[PDB]
Design a protein around this ligand. Structure first.
Ligand SMILES: COc1cc(Nc2c(C#N)cnc3cc(OCCCN4CCN(C)CC4)c(OC)cc23)c(Cl)cc1Cl
Ligand SMILES: COc1cc(Nc2c(C#N)cnc3cc(OCCCN4CCN(C)CC4)c(OC)cc23)c(Cl)cc1Cl
Ligand SMILES: COc1cc(Nc2c(C#N)cnc3cc(OCCCN4CCN(C)CC4)c(OC)cc23)c(Cl)cc1Cl
Lengths: 436, 436, 436
């Protein structure tokens, strides 16, 4: 209601809801607005709204984006925190021509600065990860700023509890994997998995079997493989052992991690040799996680297959995301203007793609009411030569019906992909079972 | 509400909603009113309403119709931009007795004038085409005016993006066919396909297989076939190569196209020889596109068949348009006063046409609520002698039901045509499947 | 019953039922056995059985395969006419290094010899065509032998009647296309379309629109296009005009065509110049008709598309033929050992191909009872690069159910093709609608 009058809207920043830059007309200043559609998840979402908004009203640190107001309109809600254009940090670093232990200590310092602040404020972030770490501006000396989300929480003093199972498999502490009570410490363990990538540019734990990754993360199995770690100050490796401590009660606090300066004093005393190889690996990992970290709705069994399969999965995925969100612009991009469907709504007929579907993204399901969580089971992929491929899978869809009751629906889908002009395009689409 | 009191309504101008001339009573002046029925497409439409209305509030150019207000009434909405009676341009030109390079340069100049204005205003038209090009009046020296629609958009400065797949197959730039980000340039490419028709009176690209037309349009395959292009100044051909540039970043801007005057200076320096043959071809093409450009809901496979088939398709089409719109006047015109149906609503009986159907165009589906997108598959046509013919097809119909949920329905239809008095008339009609 | 004891069976010759070589044990001699499965078409078939068997008991010509007996066993019937291994004639001719008017006259002579015999016997073949023309042996001086089928008939003396619409579109006389009574003449007209190919190596009539081909065939529109016909004796061209006569009553009889020897006397007097170009065209046409003449169950609209489409249609076709016949050997050849289905019998699951289907070709529908005529409508094909492709179509299937009543069933199918090792292979298969 009120954000309609005072503010003007401009380009999108990110998506998930949509982030967009705006500027206040009345006292002219830029901000960034979270547009949270009135369709979230009934209750579990609204709860996380007010939590995120409250936490951010409380968190005012020079290294953390601070909110301004949160306005509720008719078909939307708006959250206006502080704006930025900096790119990601793990993205800026690779662009650096001199990366040293001393640039990494400059990072973990600002990081631990945002963290300590809030840990003093009786709040734990729980989701700490490269994605969540960003750069104020691209302008020189821009600050690292912690990204407040959203699996976040308010602890009582130092009291440890069970706040439920949240965060990213690689960024998860053992106390949380053991299903034991936790607290501020589960944040320190992230930093430790973060520092380790902030040096050698690969993660301390990982496995394709996530059951195994977790075992490592519960067993504290990491090591400093030579040669790359040989050029690393033993102080660096010391902090890393203090954060990466299995027992949270023995785990170095955030306050303690600032005082011990393999960062502040190795800024004063550590190795600056530009490690170009680390930086490269880093960049590679980043691209991978961007494409691989695509979605947590993927169920199947493989063993390290052709990255071109992992790419064609990511695509199938990007398409189904457009479908649910009501995003038509993106739907036409990924589909051949000559695409042919076979679908239950077709009533048994074959169709030309760019005629039939318009209706649905127009007024059907496009941004209707409730989230329908989509599950994709046992996909299977055929690769025929360099430019073509086809993918067969079962999509199970959890939605709220008119009554408001939830239902499930399962449809068999085949999709057929042709790469023309470096871009994959959908050509045939074949859907079995019910209408989505 | 307010357009009811101030304005008086008169004859229709065009249709799609309906354009109509009116005059403001209070300060007496003529305008042209878009009557957009409250049934549009739920959301996707309303979005394009406010976009079109906003863009036109912003676009004030001497060569572009300017809006005045946009009024919302109960069962209708009204958009009042500037009025005209000029006929189409590609229509006026053929009527000209002297057409030269210098009349064509006089056109592309005014054109590029409307375009440049808006390109400066951070807006791209995306649909540029003869239809969209009109003449203020039939009065001497009347101005060309760009027709603002509606696949239109607001770019940020010069930033290129993916705005989704829109426009007419012949008028589509390659950057859009390649599914790459685009911007203002996709407008310049249209002008180039426009100039080329504005000289020789046939288009640079075309094929019946639209997959092929697009390949040409992606490959920039056009050439200047002799003799007709032999009498054309090499400056003319120069601009044409600058607009028709495949790479948008290398593509001549609109600002650049005005300064280079194969138009302004060839107005001063170019060929005036009245090319009568070009003008004729032009006129022919026009009629064809008017009849052929009928609708984008046609699916089938043919090879350049008797134009009398292409005419009898256009008709079947004109009829089904009347049906959906609720247009009865037009329905009686195309139907024999002695027409006989066989239809599901007939409950198994044969009927006399002008009794039964009245009910439906009276209160049934006539202008009910929501758009039902009609698809016509694999039509098949029998031609028996000069005056008769019959057409068999499957019509699939996408609508919103009472619940508001979308459904599909497929009906088999046969229609039988008799030409009496130069006009085709429906005589028998046979519908299978469900009631529409 | 009796063919079980006396005869031994060996390799297949052809298929349609199956032809196979055998040898009589008791008086040792080779023959060729038609194995007509007890599933034919109820009555319409059994009628053509006894007709074919009767006609062949009657037709004993040195140039026509003569039957010996026709034995009825439990689950099969056997027809034993005379055996051959000669290859096809239009196939042998191309292999010839000297082809002249005099070799062609040597052919049409033997041909007219088999024809005249039977025309004297009150029987008309009605299906005359390259396929039906074969070579006794590959041994020197092997004889041309007419292949007795099967759209055949017994006329009374010279009385003309309506024997119904049969034969091949190109090989059809006008009196039959006009739907007028006919007789022996409809055989002479074939020879005339045959001679014409027996010289220049392309047919007199043809069009892709079969409505048009028939118009030519009803209008007698053929001409002798220069240069290739320039080197042809005017006698040759004379016979051709006598056979290719529109009015059957004016049409040269078979008896008359033997006496006029542009064949026997031009054997004595005509052009022998080896026409290598004609022979080449011939061979090409042959391959085309073999692949194109595949089946008469194909419905759609195209215009002369990439021969690689015409090839991938022929394949889809070859596969569906294997399915219906119960031919598993052929089914595994055309299918990837890693093929994945999605099918109604799958009960909503994705399967590995070479596990699931065995059951069906084992005891399900494999050679069950009755013919199920398969119709394939509006196929549509996507070509992605050289090695891959996918085809979407609606297959309608006319069968006899348990009751013996006929039913129809329509299924939507997508098939996906990968060429590996010069051979196309099926990889994914997706079937919608009911179980076949
Ligand atoms: C709920 O909070 C979240 C918000 C955000 N999103 C952003 C916020 C906030 N908030 C603030 N500022 C951002 C600035 C951005 O940079 C501009 C990028 C345009 N460039 C144009 C030129 N080309 C060459 C490069 C790209 C940006 O995009 C990367 C995202 C931003 C995210 Cl990503 C996640 C969560 Cl969880
Ligand atoms: C959404 O905007 C659009 C609006 C319009 N429509 C028009 C606007 C507007 N706006 C303004 N002025 C028009 C003047 C016209 O000329 C009068 C024709 C009557 N003549 C009577 C005498 N006889 C011999 C010849 C015909 C006219 O009809 C051809 C259409 C007009 C269109 Cl076509 C498309 C879009 Cl997308
Ligand atoms: C209902 O009557 C019909 C019967 C037949 N079928 C045949 C009859 C009969 N009858 C007699 N003799 C045949 C001899 C054949 O040649 C042997 C080919 C094996 N070669 C092995 C070596 N490699 C290199 C080449 C192939 C043959 O196959 C082409 C088919 C034959 C037909 Cl095609 C159609 C109808 Cl309508």
């Amino acid at each position: 209601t009120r954000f309609t009058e005072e503010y003007q809207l401009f380009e999108e920043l990110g998506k998930g809801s949509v982030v967009r830059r705006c500027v206040k007309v009345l006292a002219g200043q830029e901000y960034a607005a979270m547009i949270i559609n009135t369709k979230k998840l009934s209750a579990r979402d609204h709860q996380k709204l007010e939590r995120e908004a409250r936490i951010c009203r409380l968190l005012k640190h020079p290294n953390i984006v601070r909110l301004h107001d949160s306005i509720s309109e008719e078909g939307h809600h708006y959250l206006i925190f502080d704006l930025v254009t900096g790119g990601e940090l793990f993205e800026d670093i690779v662009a650096r021509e001199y990366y040293s232990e001393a640039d990494a200590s400059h990072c973990i310092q600002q990081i631990l600065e945002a963290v300590l602040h809030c840990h003093q404020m009786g709040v734990v972030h729980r989701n700490l990860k490269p994605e969540n770490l960003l750069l104020a501006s691209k302008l020189k000396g821009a600050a690292v700023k912690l990204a407040d989300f959203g699996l976040a929480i308010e602890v009582e003093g130092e009291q440890q509890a069970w706040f439920g199972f949240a965060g990213t498999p690689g960024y998860l502490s053992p106390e949380v994997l053991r299903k034991d009570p936790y607290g501020k410490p589960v944040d320190l363990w992230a930093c430790g998995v973060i520092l380790y990538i902030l040096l050698v540019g690969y993660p301390p734990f990982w496995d394709e079997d996530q059951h195994r990754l977790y075992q490592q993360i519960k067993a504290g199995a990491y090591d400093f493989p030579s040669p790359e770690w040989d050029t690393v100050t033993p102080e660096a490796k010391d902090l890393i052992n203090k954060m990466l401590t299995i027992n949270p009660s023995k785990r170095i606090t955030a306050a303690e991690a600032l005082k011990h300066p393999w960062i502040s004093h190795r800024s004063t005393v550590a190795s600056c040799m530009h490690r170009q190889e680390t930086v490269d690996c880093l960049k590679k990992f980043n691209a991978r996680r961007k494409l691989k970290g695509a979605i947590l709705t993927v169920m199947l069994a493989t063993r390290n297959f052709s990255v071109r399969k992992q790419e064609i999965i990511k695509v199938t995925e990007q398409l189904i995301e457009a479908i649910s969100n009501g995003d038509f612009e993106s739907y036409t991009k990924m589909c051949d203007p000559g695409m042919t469907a076979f679908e239950p709504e077709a009533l048994g007929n074959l169709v030309e793609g760019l005629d039939f579907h318009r209706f649905y993204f127009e007024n059907l399901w496009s941004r209707n009411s409730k989230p329908v969580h989509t599950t994709i089971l046992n996909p299977h992929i055929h690769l025929m030569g360099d430019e073509s491929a086809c993918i067969a899978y079962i999509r199970i869809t959890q939605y709220l019906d008119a009554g408001g009751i939830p239902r499930t629906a399962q449809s068999e889908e085949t999709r057929v992909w042709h790469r023309r002009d470096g871009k994959w395009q959908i050509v045939h689409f074949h859907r079995s079972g019910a209408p989505s």
